[PDB]
């Protein structure tokens, strides 16, 4: 709906730096573009913008081509490691950008309060921090009524309190009907706030789905630590013959390592004894899926300690 990509591919010379990318995006679903060695971490990111052209197919941003100014008036974008014009003041930097995007000038002093920059407004950009510039680079993306945000590493250098409510600002925005696209390298911290992932490598798309979808896709184990389980023996062996590994932790707790294709029906079996007693599930995270799909893309692991 918001971003539709139909089979596009991109080449600098004749080598395909992006090959056969086919994405989709709804109106409220946020999306995590993750790449590390393929070019599509950034050349697909330019292709949502009007920075490049789809050399094979075509893209559709909000049902339109991404070079129209009516598209870009409702499109926010935040690049990584941006420093602004450092001799210019902070409030006039947004007042420069609000004139460019056609935003009303009443929105400028609200957004400096909305990113928490009113104490640091009317100061130079050279006397800002890294994350203090990142509040400013967020604030230009919130100009107007931005239907689409593209945030390439939005939380780098930020304060730890300032990271969390930024996602709540995103959760304010995606509940308001403006789908965003994230592009991070730090995978825990976006995985609690992403809605579906867009992991891709080697210039091609590897997998797109929810975090529930990829653990349904990838065969990847969980750890179900169930504390306080009584009777200790017949509830231990019943997971071993069912194709799983039950750890016999001797403090009345049974840790079942399963394959998660039978995830909820063992979880209903964990309420079948009547005393589950504050269980804990350890799903494999986003970076655990990222280690999987490089082997699916053929990128080998390192040695026992390399990087």
């Amino acid at each position: 709906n918001a971003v539709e990509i139909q089979g596009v591919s991109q080449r600098y010379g004749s080598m395909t730096v992006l090959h056969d990318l086919n994405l989709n995006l709804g109106e409220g679903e946020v999306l995590g573009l993750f790449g590390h060695n393929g070019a599509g971490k950034t050349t697909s990111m330019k292709l949502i913008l009007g920075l490049l052209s789809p050399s094979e197919g075509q893209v559709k941003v909000l049902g339109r081509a991404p070079n129209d100014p009516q598209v870009r008036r409702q499109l926010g974008y935040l690049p990584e490691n941006v420093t602004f014009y450092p001799q210019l003041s902070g409030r006039e930097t947004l007042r420069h950008f609000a004139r460019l995007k056609g935003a009303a000038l009443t929105q400028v002093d609200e957004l400096l309060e909305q990113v928490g920059l009113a104490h640091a407004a009317d100061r130079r950009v050279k006397t800002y921090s890294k994350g203090m510039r990142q509040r400013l680079g967020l604030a230009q993306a919130l100009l107007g009524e931005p239907r689409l945000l593209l945030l390439d590493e939005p939380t780098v250098g930020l304060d730890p309190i300032a990271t969390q409510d930024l996602y709540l600002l995103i959760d304010r925005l995606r509940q308001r009907g403006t789908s965003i696209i994230l592009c991070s390298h730090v995978l825990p911290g976006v995985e609690a706030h992403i809605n579906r992932a867009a992991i891709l490598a080697k210039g091609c798309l590897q997998a797109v789905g929810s975090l529930s979808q990829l653990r349904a896709e990838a065969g990847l184990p969980v750890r179900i630590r169930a504390s306080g389980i009584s009777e200790r023996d017949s509830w231990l062996q019943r997971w071993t013959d069912a194709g799983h590994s039950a750890r016999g932790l001797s403090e009345s707790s049974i840790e079942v390592v399963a394959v998660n294709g039978h995830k909820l029906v063992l979880l209903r079996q964990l309420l079948g004894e009547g005393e589950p007693e504050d269980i804990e599930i350890h799903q494999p995270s986003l970076e655990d899926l990222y280690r999987y799909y490089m082997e699916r893309a053929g990128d080998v692991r390192a040695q026992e300690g390399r990087l």
Binding site: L49, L51, Y77, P79, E80, V82, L88, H96, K101, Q140
Partner: protein, 264 residues
């Protein structure tokens, strides 16, 4: 139009540059410095104005090259150039807005450099009959802006090409050496050696290839009274097109600046 809206930034970014206010004050105190020492050693106006114009052959490129060498590549290191292309702009509206926005800076530099200096000259003779100076400096103020607007556009050609700010200054100091103090200096030696196969009488018929000589050609038009500038007195062309070629060195250089901006 948003080409003015980016020019409101570069006007405000140019005036808050610490180096640009230093050189333009140093331009203005040397503007009166040729003027005060050209009046106290005299007692007129057009004899000292070529030495006043020889000051602007150095500094009006150096005002322009300090201001505009980091416009395209200085926003590419900052990443705002990648941000500005996502904004509803053309590529040329970034460049023409930077050219207008830097252009009214150094137009205002000669209105604070020459404008105090020439009005001091009318307030140091009192009987120079100041209405005749308006036809002198009005022929001189426009050319000083038209000189530096070429060197704005030569800054945008080099800053479109390079990939970092440090190598931008290595081309910015290269063009200020080559156009001001080398391309006249090669024509001194080209007078004395080129006579057998390459006739030097046919040499200055098409010497449009250095605009700072054309800046010196317009500022001695009818007020000669020199050295390498005597070769332009052999021109059978009128001086009205000597204006027009200097305005042509904007648009030839801006089209090279626009086409290099579309290759990023």
């Amino acid at each position: 139009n948003q080409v003015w809206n980016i020019a409101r930034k570069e006007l405000s970014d140019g005036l808050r540059n610490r180096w640009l206010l230093a050189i333009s004050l140093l331009f203005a105190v040397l503007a009166v410095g040729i003027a005060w020492l050209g009046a106290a050693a005299s007692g007129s106006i057009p004899a000292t104005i070529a030495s006043l114009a020889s000051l602007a052959t150095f500094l009006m490129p150096l005002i322009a090259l300090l201001l505009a060498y980091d416009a395209i590549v200085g926003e590419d290191e900052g990443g705002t150039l990648m941000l500005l292309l996502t904004y509803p702009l053309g590529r040329g509206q970034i460049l023409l807005g930077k050219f207008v926005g830097h252009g009214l800076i150094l137009a205002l530099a000669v209105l604070i450099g020459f404008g105090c200096a020439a009005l001091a000259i009318a307030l140091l003779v009192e009987g120079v009959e100041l209405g005749m100076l308006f036809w002198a400096f009005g022929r001189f103020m426009i050319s000083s802006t038209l000189l530096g607007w070429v060197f704005l556009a030569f800054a945008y050609v080099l800053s479109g090409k390079v990939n970092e700010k440090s190598s931008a200054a290595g081309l910015a100091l290269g063009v200020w050496f080559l156009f001001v103090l080398v391309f006249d200096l090669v024509l001194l030696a080209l007078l004395v050696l080129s006579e057998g196969k390459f006739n030097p009488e046919l040499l200055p018929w098409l010497l449009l290839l250095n605009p700072t000589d054309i800046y010196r050609l317009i500022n001695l038009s009818g007020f000669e009274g020199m050295g390498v500038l005597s070769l332009g007195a052999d021109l059978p062309v009128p001086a009205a097109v000597l204006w027009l070629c200097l305005l042509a060195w904007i648009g030839v250089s801006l089209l090279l600046a626009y086409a290099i901006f579309r290759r990023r």
